[PDB]
Design a protein around this ligand. Structure first.
Ligand SMILES: NCCC(O)(P(=O)(O)O)P(=O)(O)O
Ligand SMILES: [Mg+2]
Ligand SMILES: [Mg+2]
Ligand SMILES: [Mg+2]
Length: 340
């Protein structure tokens, strides 16, 4: 089971895990994609890819997604972790120019992914393949919203690059704002929509209950990552972690900061339970007797159900994934699955 310091009894009792039926094929298809797109060396794909559990993380989240939608999401999620690793290595090795050029290419490819499917930088070509596929499911209005959100994510990664190269730890509130962008809260929230087959109108997805449920699902996922990834992040000189901000700016000991992060995570769960009632009541209200109302109600219900599924998927991912097993590495500062 889960060690006491990381255990969340409410998740275990009230957020039962779910798994999408396409998971076995999803796992192998993403492994093949990482190999074919040269996002990881063949030996590292064979030794670590399945053990990283990226497809499991998505298959526990976007329940009900069409298989091809889930495949594009899973490829994107694996890509997103490889990009996190590249960013980290560029920082560690002082590759400011390589990072700046990658950042510019990602902004361009995000707006024009088809143009970049055969780019010489394999990380850019793999990004472009996953994004072009994500852009084929819903109207171009959704694509434009995904792009606006991801442009903001890329710039948050750039701010992290500057923080780490200058040895700056953000303040707590600065960190919490930044973390909604580096974790890509609004991208995961956008991806609920192709998974349930419907672009939600602005009036629906901006309803306060939908917005707050979406926010709390992501805050839990990001801050539980902070709690569980703290050991590897301290070992890797990462500065972006709520516990690190608390130690640096509020004078907490390691133990005190861990307890504070845990309490904030636990409160996300019970705040989510309150707002979920309101979001499901809104879903009921959307079912106004019309065909479109039934469609919107069902989509909102499926999306809020997946906001709930994110809690359990993220919880178990952190205990299953090889990504965080720092105690097993020869060099605690260099995870074996990254290209160093
Ligand atoms: N979400 C991507 C990877 C992370 O969660 P990880 O802790 O590096 O796995 P980050 O903290 O960098 O956001
Ligand atoms: Mg990271
Ligand atoms: Mg990161
Ligand atoms: Mg982390």
């Amino acid at each position: 089971a889960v060690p006491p310091s990381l255990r969340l009894p409410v998740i275990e009792a009230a957020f039962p895990r779910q798994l999408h039926p396409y998971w076995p094929k999803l796992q192998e298809t993403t492994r093949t994609w990482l190999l074919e797109k040269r996002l990881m060396p063949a030996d590292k794909v064979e030794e670590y890819a399945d053990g990283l559990c990226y497809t499991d993380l998505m298959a526990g989240y976007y329940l009900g997604a069409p298989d091809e939608v889930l495949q594009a999401i899973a490829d994107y999620s694996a890509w997103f972790h490889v990009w996190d690793d590249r960013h980290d290595r560029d920082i560690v090795h002082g590759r400011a120019g390589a990072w700046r050029r990658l950042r510019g290419l990602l902004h361009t490819a995000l707006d024009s992914p088809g143009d970049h499917l055969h780019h010489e930088d394999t990380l850019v070509a793999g990004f472009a393949d996953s994004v072009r596929r994500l852009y084929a499911f819903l109207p171009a209005t959704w694509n434009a919203r995904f792009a606006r959100h991801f442009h903001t994510v890329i710039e948050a990664y750039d701010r992290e690059f500057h923080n780490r190269t200058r040895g700056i730890v953000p303040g707590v509130e600065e960190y919490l704002e930044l973390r909604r962008l580096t974790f890509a809260h609004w991208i995961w929230t956008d991806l609920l929509e192709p998974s349930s087959g419907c672009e939600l109108p602005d009036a629906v997805r901006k309803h306060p209950a939908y917005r707050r449920a979406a926010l709390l699902s992501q805050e839990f996922a990001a801050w539980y990552n902070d709690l569980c990834s703290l050991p590897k992040e301290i070992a890797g000189d990462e500065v972006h972690n709520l516990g690190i901000s608390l130690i640096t700016h509020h004078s907490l000991t390691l133990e005190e900061a861990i307890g504070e992060v845990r309490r904030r995570v636990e409160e996300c769960i019970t705040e989510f339970l309150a707002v979920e009632r309101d979001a499901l009541r809104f879903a009921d209200e959307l079912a106004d007797g019309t065909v479109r109302g039934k469609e919107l109600s069902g989509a909102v219900r499926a999306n809020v159900g997946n906001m709930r599924n994110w809690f359990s998927s993220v919880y178990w991912f952190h205990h299953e994934s090889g990504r965080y097993m720092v105690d097993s590495w020869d060099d605690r500062s260099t995870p074996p699955y990254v290209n160093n």
